[PDB]
Structure formats: C-alpha cells, structure tokens
Ligand binder design. Structure first.
Ligand code: K
Ligand code: K
Ligand code: ZN
Lengths: 362, 5
C-alpha cells in the first residue's frame, strides 16, 4: 500500500511557492475527489532539521535563506550570490516551507528504508535545480538530493529518473562524482533554454564518469516516441546499473497545455514510463516538480496516482473545491496540441547509440 | 546563468 505524504498544514505551506500558488491544494483536492487517498497510507511529513539540510546545502547558503525568509526580504543585496531574485524570490517563510518539503521527501525515503511501503509519494517535492550553495529554477532546497542521501543509508545503488521538462542539473551535480547514484534525465535541450546543461556528452566526472545519463530532446515530442526513448534508455540502464532503489521526478511541465509550450505529452505517455519502472518492484520514491498549467498538473499527478494504485479513473472530473478550474469540459483527459514534433528519428537513434556506448563502461 | 521563468 503506497505511502502518501500529506497534511493540511504541509499543503498550505506548499501553496505559497511563488511560481505555483495554490497548486498543492489543487493536486491534493483532485486526488481526494477521486478517493485515492483511501487506498494509500497517509503519513504526516517531519520537518527537516538544520542538520538534515546541511548534509547537502552549505551553512552560508542556509543562513542567508533563513535570514531573508524571516520577513520576506526580497530586496536583500546578497541574494543574487545565493541564486535568489526573479526565478527564486525571497518569499516570506520560504526557508521553513523548503524545510517542510525537504523533510517530506526525507520522510518518504525513511518510509521506504523501513519497509513500510514499496512506493512513497511527495507530489510537492522534486525541486531538482537547487545547488549546495544556490537557489535555482524555482528550487530553494534540493529535496530530491536530500531524499537520495537518506536512501543511501540502506541502498548502495540508487537510480534517479527525471522526467521534468528541464534538465535535473542540481541532482546530477550533487552526484556527478559518484557511482552509487546514477542520474537519468530526459529534458528539452536547446541553447537559451533553462538551465542550458545536460547534453548527451555530459556523463559525470571522475569516479562518477558514465554514471550520469542525459537524453536531450527537442520541442513537440508526443507520448509514443517519448515512451520509446524512455523505455530504451531505462532498459539499458537497469541492465547495466542494477539499481536497488529508484527516485522518480515527474514534473508535469512536459504536458500539452503548459504555458511553456515545449513538449506535447499527455499523462498517459508519462504513465507508461512510470509503469515500466514500477514493474521493477523496487523501493520507489515519487516526486512532483514543474507544471505551470495548474489544473493539467493536478490531472496528470492524479492520473499517475491511479497508475500507482492500478486503478482506472473516471473521465468526469468529480465535484470538489477547484471544480471550476477544469471547465468548460470537466474531463481528466488531456489533448495534444497540433504542432510539429521537432525530433528527427535519426537524431534520436544516435543519442540512444551514444548512451549505450556510455553504459558499456558501467 | 539562465532564467527559467
Ligand atoms: K528532466
Ligand atoms: K552519478
Ligand atoms: Zn521543469
């Protein structure tokens, strides 16, 4: 029975994140409206201690975030050094909101260590851009890294899979020098597109060389081709790396209708990737991430919660607090845009061949 | 340093 990390107070904190106001409530509300919480073990998150957060983040960065968080000083002159500014404003309380999210992911990971469940979910986590000493890309603390470091207490090989629209650079950086954690990111890669890293030739460094995997993808990819790429890469990675636990980041900014308007995915395509990973029967930590069409992001993660539970959901959006956000059609399904797929099969094939060459060294 | 956003 999957663990679902949730409390009303936790969701209320996550609702205050500057670039996604109210999204956590919308996601939880729709999950609850489909009664999926009744088939999961609800676990209240523990807040991360300063010591928890400092296993990855530097004391100087943590101290700055704490300082500007106290009153929401979005005009502190030292914020740009620590990555705060336009993408990451110093929202009042953000230090404590981030510690709550980091603690929730750590709590998920601890549930997995203890054998409480085989799947633990923190849909309000996944803030994969944050660096040891810098906020980045709407991420202030890197809860994914914190969750992986907690799993490292028990699991000697952790596979991180990152299906967000953006490259999971903060997680890849954290583990770039180690072979205990393999990071695998599928993302849009185009000069000028954030964060600008994650070409197929980026494979990690030192003892971690070939233990980072990047799949650079162009605008317009749809469900079938995405799943083909994902299954091909993950098949090779599973055989080469033999993970004992998986952390899966499922940012919904890939989904048709997102204002970023880059990929052209539906939750069905992501759900097939998720099913492939669940079939490994490993301890699996499930995280959210990006997603800036808020109703579509709730649709996606609600559908994926159903996939985790093996449950087929009704097309009709049930009545709930945010029902009117789903109009005028009020259905769960998302329809792809009619715009071109810029991914040429020959380029995708060469990327896959390059990755297979990389993974022979593993 | 890129902008996201
Ligand atoms: K990604
Ligand atoms: K690595
Ligand atoms: Zn993203």
């Amino acid at each position: 029975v999957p663990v679902y990390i949730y409390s009303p107070e936790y969701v209320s904190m996550c609702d205050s994140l500057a670039k996604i106001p109210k999204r956590a409530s919308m996601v939880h509300s729709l999950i609850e409206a489909y009664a999926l919480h009744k088939q999961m073990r609800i676990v209240k998150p523990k807040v991360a201690s300063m010591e928890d957060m400092a296993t990855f983040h530097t004391d100087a960065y943590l101290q700055h975030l704490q300082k500007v968080s106290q009153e929401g000083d979005d005009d502190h002159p030292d914020s740009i050094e620590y990555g705060l500014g336009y993408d990451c404003p110093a929202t009042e309380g953000i230090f404590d909101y981030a510690a709550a999210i980091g603690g929730a992911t750590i709590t998920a990971a601890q549930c997995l260590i203890d054998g409480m469940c085989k799947v633990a979910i923190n849909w309000s986590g996944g803030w994969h851009h944050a660096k040891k000493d810098e906020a980045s890309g709407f991420c202030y603390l890197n809860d994914a890294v914190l969750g992986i470091l907690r799993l490292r207490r028990k699991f000697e090989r952790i596979l991180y899979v990152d299906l967000d629209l953006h490259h999971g650079d903060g997680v890849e950086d954290a583990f770039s020098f180690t072979s205990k954690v393999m990071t695998v990111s599928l993302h849009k890669f185009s000069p000028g597109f954030f964060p600008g890293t994650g070409d197929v030739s980026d494979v990690g460094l030192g003892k971690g060389r070939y233990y980072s995997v990047n799949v650079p993808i162009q605008d317009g990819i749809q469900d079938e081709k995405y799943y083909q790429i994902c299954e091909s890469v993950l098949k090779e990675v599973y055989q080469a790396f033999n993970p004992k636990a998986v952390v899966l980041q499922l940012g919904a900014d890939t989904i048709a209708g997102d204002p970023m308007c880059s990929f052209n995915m539906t939750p069905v395509g992501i759900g097939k990737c998720l099913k492939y990973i669940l079939q490994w029967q490993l301890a699996t930590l499930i995280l959210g991430g990006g997603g800036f069409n808020l109703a579509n992001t709730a649709r996606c993660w609600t559908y994926l919660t159903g996939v985790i539970l093996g449950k087929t959901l009704s097309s009709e959006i049930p009545d709930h607090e945010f029902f009117t956000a789903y109009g005028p059609d009020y259905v769960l399904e998302i329809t792809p845009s009619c715009r071109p797929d810029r991914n040429e099969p020959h380029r995708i094939q060469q990327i896959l061949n390059y990755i297979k060459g990389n993974l022979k060294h593993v | 340093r890129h902008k996201k956003x």
